Amino acid sequence: ASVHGTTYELLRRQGIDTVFGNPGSNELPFLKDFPEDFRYILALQEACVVGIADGYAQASRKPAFINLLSAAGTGNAMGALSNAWNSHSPLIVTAGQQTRAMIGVEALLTNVDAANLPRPLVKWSYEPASAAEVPHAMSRAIHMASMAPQGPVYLSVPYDDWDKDADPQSHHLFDRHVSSSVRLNDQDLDILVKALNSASNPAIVLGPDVDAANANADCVMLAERLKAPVWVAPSAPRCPFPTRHPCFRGLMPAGIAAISQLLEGHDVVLVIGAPVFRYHQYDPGQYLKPGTRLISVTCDPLEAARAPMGDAIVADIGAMASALANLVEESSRQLPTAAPEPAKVDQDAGRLHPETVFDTLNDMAPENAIYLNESTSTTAQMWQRLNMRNPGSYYFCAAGGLGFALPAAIGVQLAEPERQVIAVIGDGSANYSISALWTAAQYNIPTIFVIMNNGTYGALRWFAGVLEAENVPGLDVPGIDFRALAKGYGVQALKADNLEQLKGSLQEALSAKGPVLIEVSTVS
Amino acid sequence: ASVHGTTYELLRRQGIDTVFGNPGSNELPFLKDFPEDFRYILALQEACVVGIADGYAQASRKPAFINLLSAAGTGNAMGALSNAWNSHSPLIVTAGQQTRAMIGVEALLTNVDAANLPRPLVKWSYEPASAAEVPHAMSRAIHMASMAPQGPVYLSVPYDDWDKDADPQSHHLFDRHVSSSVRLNDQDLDILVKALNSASNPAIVLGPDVDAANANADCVMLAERLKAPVWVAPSAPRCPFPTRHPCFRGLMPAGIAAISQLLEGHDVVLVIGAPVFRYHQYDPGQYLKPGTRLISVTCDPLEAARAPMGDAIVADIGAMASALANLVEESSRQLPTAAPEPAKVDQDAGRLHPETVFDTLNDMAPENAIYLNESTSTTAQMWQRLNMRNPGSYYFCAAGGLGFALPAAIGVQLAEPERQVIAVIGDGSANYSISALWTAAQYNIPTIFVIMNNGTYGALRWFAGVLEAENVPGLDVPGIDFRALAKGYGVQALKADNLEQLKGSLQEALSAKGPVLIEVSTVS
Amino acid sequence: ASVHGTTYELLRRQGIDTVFGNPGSNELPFLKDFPEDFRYILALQEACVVGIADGYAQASRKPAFINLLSAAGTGNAMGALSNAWNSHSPLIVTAGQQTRAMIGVEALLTNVDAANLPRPLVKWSYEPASAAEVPHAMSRAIHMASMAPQGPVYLSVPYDDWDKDADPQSHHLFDRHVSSSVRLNDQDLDILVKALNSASNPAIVLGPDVDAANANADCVMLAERLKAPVWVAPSAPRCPFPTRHPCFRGLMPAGIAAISQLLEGHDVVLVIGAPVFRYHQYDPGQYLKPGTRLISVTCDPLEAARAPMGDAIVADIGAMASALANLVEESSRQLPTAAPEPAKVDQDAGRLHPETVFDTLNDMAPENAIYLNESTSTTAQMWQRLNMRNPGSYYFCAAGGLGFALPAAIGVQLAEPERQVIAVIGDGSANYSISALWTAAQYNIPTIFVIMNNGTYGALRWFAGVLEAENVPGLDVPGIDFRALAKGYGVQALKADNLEQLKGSLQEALSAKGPVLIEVSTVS
Ligand SMILES: Cc1ncc(Cn2c(C)c(CCOP(=O)(O)OP(=O)(O)O)sc2=O)c(N)n1
Ligand SMILES: Cc1ncc(Cn2c(C)c(CCOP(=O)(O)OP(=O)(O)O)sc2=O)c(N)n1
Ligand SMILES: Cc1ncc(Cn2c(C)c(CCOP(=O)(O)OP(=O)(O)O)sc2=O)c(N)n1
Ligand SMILES: [Ca+2]
Ligand SMILES: [Ca+2]
Ligand SMILES: [Ca+2]
Ligand SMILES: [Mg+2]
Ligand SMILES: [Mg+2]
Ligand SMILES: [Mg+2]
Ligand SMILES: [Mg+2]
Ligand SMILES: [Mg+2]
């Protein structure tokens, strides 16, 4: 067998059947004779390729496979990889290298010092020393991406390797099963359970690895048993809990002082599947108030190491959440009371308040909708106003890198064809990966894109105001016609300048058979 | 003085007055109180920011300054940096880092292991150990970018550093002059000159560092004195010689065998300002034929080290070209005869042959036009059909990374306001950095964009055909309306479905007061 | 509190009380006011410092703390770090950096790009961005070294940081408990147990992480229950099983074909705490024979990823071994028969056969002796001839890097004062870290060093013979007087030119109150 044949067999035997790519000359020998059981999803720029694959992986809860051209293609994707690192997304990034005979002279398209290029944003990065090693290196990539803590990996392959003879002993790779589905030993787990049972006023904080593990329902049972309020850890990339459950307390502010204040009076705080903590703003103070102790369950040694406070346990989130949910006592305390409904913001017949948009989405979207957020000044209101009952219902750029949501929403929609995906994206953010729209059109992936257009980088204006920073350039982005951009890439386009138009446009979009972009005129 | 004040003073004292950027929260403390004598050029995505800065630097022959947001912003620009490395572009890339107090916890927007992120695509990469070091680190960045061989550099700055007190001793940085304007010692230069004088059939090959050095006119004199044919080294990022000069022989094919065959019978081949050589296709054979010896003058030790044949001299291209041009004897041999004019390809009243487009551009464009090429299947014809008399008249992605020409053409036009820039870009390539169009509209930078639309990634189809590679996915890009994309970003748009429309559209574009995009229907 | 005070408090609260070091100017501000409850162990060169710390960590089963001077001191230790990486040794390597104000100018003793220096041989490598971050960075280092898979880490600290004020919130670091004591979830563990119970002819292979975990006794129970032969995985850094237990089958040859042949007929092979596999010699063939399936339990994702065959489970070795030992059925098969005693090699009254030396050591050493091996041509015989009943009884350079055993034997002896350490080291190997002898003398650490002197690099002569490689230089090391070297560093020295002298010298050494070196004349 050839390296080509052996590698595709390994991929299919390991459950991979889709290649997200933007093709180049170093990859043609890999892509030729493309297997009939595989599908190829083209995107027009590599940030888009990786964003789509990322959404697909996160929603499918399985690795996604990417193919890019050498250094330039990899380079165009590195902002997307920064998000993927923070979301623990299992991505296998392959990049074609020059033929081995032309690497030394640094022919055009040689990826120089290739393995160093995507560092430090990958778990493992490698170029094999010979063609026959390629299937083994691919096996390593698959497992490195897939083991807890999941994350992106990188493999560089000289284009002449594919046609070479494979090692017959590569067949041992095909069916390898590698597990990191582990939990704390019984003795120490019993100690943890007793500490939770004994707490007088426990609180729970959940992060994105809960949703990645589909541990959401187990966390609901845990919270119900402990009668504990539940917060989502700050800078949340995913939604780990039903947002109208009585225990739910919303998104934590991303500040040190703010969080210790919220946790004041809680004697034991159990954090599951989050860094401790993904703060953002400068908000100095105590990490925890006296009387609060913190216990973190994380899938990632790097998270456990860097937490500035608390104990930690490094284990699989699914296995730990299930065990805890089924082992803790049913507390006799009263179940927390549900948060009150959000206020209706006054809305005239003109430009839309973001609150109006979220309320209307919540009113009209199906109960199993999936939302993506890249409307950076409106996150707090979004979190308060969307009832997200089910797992896998929310995604936000995990490293704060704009250009995620537009392509990721296409990948999520591909992963979940029966769940309507609605991406709420600011006018500024929409541009970073605008060309991803084309993929939705070409493959008829029926994502709805809601562009919140207020003409400015609003979150930056807000932060400037905080800093009392005057005379900052580059904060306004006037003069973008999003309906024209949508037309450019073949996506149906609607406009909503007021509430009645928003309702009409959403009705049309929800009944459409293809992707739709709605440009919403929002308040400045 | 503050670090902010001291750093802007250093920048202005070192000739920097423009910041190319996409703003983020870690950069607001740098951008606040933006000096009135500086200008800020916003682009909507970081590949665009860097592409614009790159074109500006290459055309201006001076460093350009870039400001990006942390890891995600830097990451989005890494494909653009791959080109900049290969073109020796003097780019100073600054990226804002989290406040020092929040780096340890890896708060959102922390650039982890920051200096490693852009490696291996930068000459120098650094994060200072204290705020007071920032001006010195900036000085290092300026000089590292600017010394031969020029190239991109990276500086990461925690956002809290800017407001801190500067070291008064930083004033010694302001007026430092650093020179690498060096040439071979007299004794060895005399040996080289004698070898050139003694050659019976010399040939000259020129690369992009000739144009970067503005050594073009000196190379013309050298070629005239030696009565030598002149080729442009393969995969050419720039044009180093007047393309209708009698000595000119065009673009070398990017193959080992092809080049040794072209050089056969030439006893001494002098290469100036090029790698030896930027081959691309697999074309095995002899590096040089018997009877040919090669001497390379390069600004880059890495080029000299990796050449598989010939002697080399590492020195400044401007200084070496000037010295050689003025020292060699006037040969009594006959001056080479000019290449014949290109044939006119038969053209009916339908879709345009690329040859027709280039002939028409050559007929209608001003003699001091500047062209950019990202029409990947048409490069050979472009090189044959455009009379480029002046320096700085051609740019092509130096690492082969698409997404360069569209933003770079805006930067070039900004650098050269009196020279009409015309970017010829394929329908595939146009998408990578499509959002750069907005910058041209916003700042009214009157670049003309000619989109060669044939619905496919033609160069890849061609290479697949060569490989006899069947069943390759992802090679077609139907369904893109470039006039709508132009409208989306505020750029006047025209279409040309045939020759009469092409002529009409070019006439309108050449007389326009702002940027213009022309979508040309080209043959498949 | 100062950063100095806070950091030493963190260290002591995390169980660290010893600093292994070679001092330098960048570390004087750390070492000043050295706490009275800490001890400092000086060694004369940094390979020795790290080797001693490594032996100490491995034997103590807890992290060891190292302090070195900048780049040169770190650099001198990098061979020692290569071994530490392969043995998963929990080492915290700190290196002093220049004062922050002098880093930019690259003053003497600046560690340039410090975090990159020890890569790729460390789990985590870092320089903090401010003095107040130092305690947090130290906390990260402690936990990164200590979490499974354990390994070395690196922290660079500017010397001016120590005297600065600490953040009062650093107190939250002091008592953090971080656990990776995890095992496979119940459902999947039950599946594994059933597979073991159902095996008709199981085999067990054990690696060094078993001994590191003190899982040895649990593995004995597991082997007894399954009635399974037990091998030690190739290139063994530690001994994971009693070598005279009836199930023991010895050290596996480090070859692909050899191992699949040994395993032929075994239907299920359970590997615990080893890479699959640390082969050495080229010995091509089948990874496994038909009819054999392999299941690996490893603490290290990198091991699980790269295994070319088998299933894998990534978990704590102690937790997994305990669970398996207590869950499997008692097989009704016959217990394996103990390996026969080794043959006595004919020995005349002249130079010693290595077999004679090992037999005599086995005859005379206490039953709780600890051996180290750096006698590279005699490993197979050593493994056959020493009865090692207890855990922690054997160490061999895990990356094959010579210079380990001599210093490591001192660290092991320091860790285990009641167990006589006997290091068997070839004449070649003895030189790499010869200066470590001084530390044994100075601190009166009573290690016995047995130098096997045959005047040559015997293992290399053997491998050359295999390659049929003639005319290899540099294989002989005549003219070294090891008794004089011992005298040089203050260690009592004896010679043994024949068996009667060997017995006499060992009797004297075993009754000595300090370290002793015995130079043994062995056969060529
Ligand atoms: C790749 C990248 N570039 C720049 C930024 C900086 N940035 C920018 C530019 C924001 C403004 C986004 O504008 P928007 O129109 O999408 O939404 P709002 O007006 O609601 O803020 S928020 C923010 O962090 C970023 N996070 N990521
Ligand atoms: C960043 C990046 N991605 C992908 C490629 C691969 N690529 C691609 C996709 C080409 C086709 C460009 O299509 P076009 O429409 O711009 O021009 P032609 O039809 O004349 O080839 S040429 C080529 O090398 C690349 N060079 N750089
Ligand atoms: C740091 C280092 N340098 C060189 C070697 C190469 N080497 C060398 C030099 C060996 C010979 C050791 O000689 P010895 O006297 O200690 O033992 P033998 O005579 O029994 O081989 S075995 C071996 O792998 C090595 N493993 N590590
Ligand atoms: Ca906006
Ligand atoms: Ca095309
Ligand atoms: Ca020897
Ligand atoms: Mg990198
Ligand atoms: Mg699905
Ligand atoms: Mg100018
Ligand atoms: Mg290194
Ligand atoms: Mg002890």
Curated annotation (Swiss-Prot), chains A, B, C:
Cofactor: binding comment: Binds 1 Ca(2+) ion per subunit.
Organism expressing this protein natively: Pseudomonas putida
Cofactor(s) of this protein: Ca(2+); thiamine diphosphate; Mg(2+)
PROSITE patterns: TPP_ENZYMES
Region called Thiamine pyrophosphate binding, residue ranges: 376-459
Binding annotation for Mg(2+): 116-117, 119
Disulfide cross-links: none
Entry's EC annotation: 4.1.1.7
Enzyme class, spelled out: lyase
Catalyzed reaction equations: phenylglyoxylate + H(+) = benzaldehyde + CO2
Pfam families assigned to the protein according to its UniProt record, in alphabetical order: TPP_enzyme_C (PF02775), TPP_enzyme_M (PF00205), TPP_enzyme_N (PF02776)
Single Gene Ontology BP annotation: mandelate catabolic process
Pathway: Aromatic compound metabolism; (R)-mandelate degradation; benzoate from (R)-mandelate: step 3/4
Quaternary context: Homotetramer.
GO molecular function: acetolactate synthase activity; benzoylformate decarboxylase activity; flavin adenine dinucleotide binding; magnesium ion binding; thiamine pyrophosphate binding
Recorded family membership: Belongs to the TPP enzyme family.
Protein's recorded name: Benzoylformate decarboxylase
Keywords: Aromatic hydrocarbons catabolism, Calcium, Decarboxylase, Lyase, Magnesium, Mandelate pathway, Metal-binding, Thiamine pyrophosphate
Residues bound to Ca(2+): 427, 454, 456
